[PDB]
Amino acid sequence: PTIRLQEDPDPEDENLYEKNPDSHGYDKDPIVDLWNMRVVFFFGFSIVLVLGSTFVAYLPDYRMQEWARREAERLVKYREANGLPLMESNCFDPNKIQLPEDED
C-alpha cells in the first residue's frame, strides 16, 4: 500500500465564533457558555476580589502594632521623666545570670 498504518486525518480546528458570533470562548453550547461566563465573572470579580480585599483591609490588628506603639510611648514617657536611659544594652538582669567562676 506504500502506507504504514490506518489513521484518521488530522482535522482542522473549530472556530467557536462561526456557530456563535458572540461566543465568550467557554463552550460550544451558547447557554452553558453564557452561564460559565456569568459564574466566572460573578464569583471571581464580585465575590472573591472585592469582598476579599475589603475583608483583608479591615482585618483586626492581631499583629499588635498599635499595642506595641502605645506600650513604647508609655515606656519612653516613664524613662524620660525619671532620668533613666531610654534603652538598656542588656535585656536580661545580670542578677539572674551566673557567669562561670574562673576565666583563667
Binding site: 480546528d13 465564533y17 467557554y26 460559565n36 476580589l49 475583608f55 483583608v56 482585618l59
Partner: protein, 459 residues
C-alpha cells in the same frame, strides 16, 4: 484547618457526579468559594503561629502560599477547558481529579507540623504532576520531560528521608515547634557536613539551583498549560518553604557551607538571564526567567537575615503570579498558531490590542517595576546581600539590566513590528482569556497596596 481540606475532598465527588456539561462550571464556582474561605488564614499573630491541632499549623510564611494555591486552581480550570473540548467526559473528569488531588497535597504540605508528614506530602505532589505532563502533553518529548522531572527530584529527596529519620532517632522528635525550641548548634565534622548536604540538596533541586535545573525547561515546556501554571507558580516554592523551615537546625554550619551554593546562584543567575536573550522558543524563555528569579530566592535564603527572608517570601509570591500570567499569555498565541517559535507570529498588537496591554503589564512586572511586590522582594534581597558583602551589587546590578533587556525583547518581538502576512487565522480574544489575564494581574497590584501580607513571619 479541616474547614479548607474537607471542601476539596468534596470537590472530588462533586466533579465525578456532575452532568457531562457542567463539570467546568461546578469546579470553577466551588474552587473560587474555597479560595474565599482560605482568605481567612491571613489573620496572623505577631509572636507565634496558629496551632490548629497536633497535625496542622499556619504560619505567616505558609498562609500566602495556601491562598496562592487555592486561587491558582480556578485559573487552571479556566485555562484548561479550551484545549480539552474534544476530550471525552471521563478523561476530562480525570484531568480535574488530578488538579484537585494536586491542590489537596499542596494544601496539606504547607501546614504539616512534622517534617516526615511534610516530606510525604511534598513527595506525593509528584504523581499528579507526572501523570498530567506525560498523559496530556502535546509532543513526544513529554515522556523524557516526565522522566527528567521525576528522577532529578527523587535523587535529591531520598537522602533527605534518611537524614530525617536519623534526626528523629537522635533528638526524639520531628515536630517543628519542638525542633525550633530545642535547637542545638551543629559542630564542624564530616558527619555534620553530610547531614547538612542531605537536608539541603532536595530543596536545592526543587528551586532549582543552577546546574541542577535541566529538568525544568523540559518539564515546563512539554506540559499542558495548567501543568506549567502549577509547576511555575507553586511547586517551585516548595523548595524555598522547605529550606526556610529546615535551616533552623543547620546553624552555625551554614555560615560556610553556603558558599558554593551562593556562587552558583549568583553566576547562574547571570547565565540564565543571558540564555534568555537567545531563545527561539517562547516558553523556554519564561522557564529560564523562573530559574533566574529562583536563584535570587536561593541567595536570600542562604544569607539568613530577616530582610532576606522577607524578600524571599515577597519574591516567591510575586513570581508565582507573574510566571503563571506569562505562561497563559504564551499559550493563547500557541492555541492560535499551533507553534511555540517566537518570531513566527509578529505585530500582534495590531491584531489584538487588549492582549498587547496584558503582555505589557506582565512584562513590566517581570522586570520589577516599582512599586510592584516583585521589586519589593528584589530590593530587600539586594539590600541584604549588600550588607552581606558590598561586591554583590555588581552581580545583582548586571542581573537587573539583563532582565529588563530580555523582558522587553520578548515584548517587542511578539507585539511590535509587522504582522506575518501568511497567518490569517488570528481570531479576536475570547472573554475567557481576558478574564484569565485580569484575574492574574489585579491581585498583584492589590497586594502592592498592602505588602505586609506577603512579607513572611520576620515582619
Amino acid at each position: 484547618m479541616l474547614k479548607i481540606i474537607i471542601p476539596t475532598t468534596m470537590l472530588l465527588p462533586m466533579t465525578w457526579m456532575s452532568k457531562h456539561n457542567m463539570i467546568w462550571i461546578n469546579a470553577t464556582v466551588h474552587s473560587l468559594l474555597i479560595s474565599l474561605i482560605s482568605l481567612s488564614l491571613l489573620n496572623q499573630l505577631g509572636e507565634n503561629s496558629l496551632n490548629f491541632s497536633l497535625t496542622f499549623f499556619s504560619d505567616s510564611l505558609s498562609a500566602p502560599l495556601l491562598v496562592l494555591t487555592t486561587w491558582l486552581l480556578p485559573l487552571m480550570l479556566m485555562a484548561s477547558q479550551s484545549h480539552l473540548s474534544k476530550e471525552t467526559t471521563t478523561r476530562k473528569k480525570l484531568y480535574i481529579t488530578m488538579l484537585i488531588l494536586l491542590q489537596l497535597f499542596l494544601i496539606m504540605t504547607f501546614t504539616a507540623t512534622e517534617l516526615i508528614l511534610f516530606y510525604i506530602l511534598f513527595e506525593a505532589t509528584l504523581v499528579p504532576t507526572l501523570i498530567i505532563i506525560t498523559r496530556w502533553g502535546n509532543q513526544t518529548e513529554r515522556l523524557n520531560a516526565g522522566l527528567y522531572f521525576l528522577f532529578y527530584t527523587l535523587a535529591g529527596s531520598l537522602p533527605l528521608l534518611v537524614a530525617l529519620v536519623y534526626i528523629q532517632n537522635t533528638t526524639g522528635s520531628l515536630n517543628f515547634l519542638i525542633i525550633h525550641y530545642w535547637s542545638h548548634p551543629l559542630s564542624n565534622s564530616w558527619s555534620n557536613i553530610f547531614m547538612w548536604l542531605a537536608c539541603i540538596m532536595a530543596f536545592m533541586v526543587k528551586m532549582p539551583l543552577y546546574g541542577l535545573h535541566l529538568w525544568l525547561p523540559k518539564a515546563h515546556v512539554e506540559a499542558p498549560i495548567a501543568g506549567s501554571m502549577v509547576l511555575a507558580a507553586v511547586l517551585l516554592k516548595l523548595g524555598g518553604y522547605g529550606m526556610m523551615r529546615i535551616t533552623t537546625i543547620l546553624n552555625p554550619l551554614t555560615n560556610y557551607m553556603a558558599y558554593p551554593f551562593l556562587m552558583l546562584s549568583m553566576w547562574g543567575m547571570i547565565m540564565t538571564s543571558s540564555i534568555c536573550l537567545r531563545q527561539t522558543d517562547l516558553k523556554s524563555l519564561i522557564a529560564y526567567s523562573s530559574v533566574s528569579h529562583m536563584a535570587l530566592v536561593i541567595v536570600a535564603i542562604m544569607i539568613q537575615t530577616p530582610w532576606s527572608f522577607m524578600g524571599a517570601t515577597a519574591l516567591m509570591i510575586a513570581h508565582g503570579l507573574t510566571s503563571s500570567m506569562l505562561f497563559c499569555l504564551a499559550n493563547t498565541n500557541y492555541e492560535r498558531v499551533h507553534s511555540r517559535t517566537m518570531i513566527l507570529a509578529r505585530g500582534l498588537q495590531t491584531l489584538l490590542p487588549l492582549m498587547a496591554t496584558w503582555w505589557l503589564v506582565a512584562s513590566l512586572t517581570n522586570l520589577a517595576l516599582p512599586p510592584s511586590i516583585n521589586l519589593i522582594g528584589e530590593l530587600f534581597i539586594i539590600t541584604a546581600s549588600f550588607s552581606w558583602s558590598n561586591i554583590t551589587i555588581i552581580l545583582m546590578g548586571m542581573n537587573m539590566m539583563i532582565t529588563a533587556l530580555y523582558s522587553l525583547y520578548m515584548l517587542i518581538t511578539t507585539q511590535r513590528g509587522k504582522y506575518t502576512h501568511h497567518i490569517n487565522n488570528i481570531k479576536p480574544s475570547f472573554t475567557r482569556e481576558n478574564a484569565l489575564m485580569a484575574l492574574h494581574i489585579l491581585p498583584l497590584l492589590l497586594l502592592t497596596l498592602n505588602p505586609k501580607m506577603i512579607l513572611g513571619p520576620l515582619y
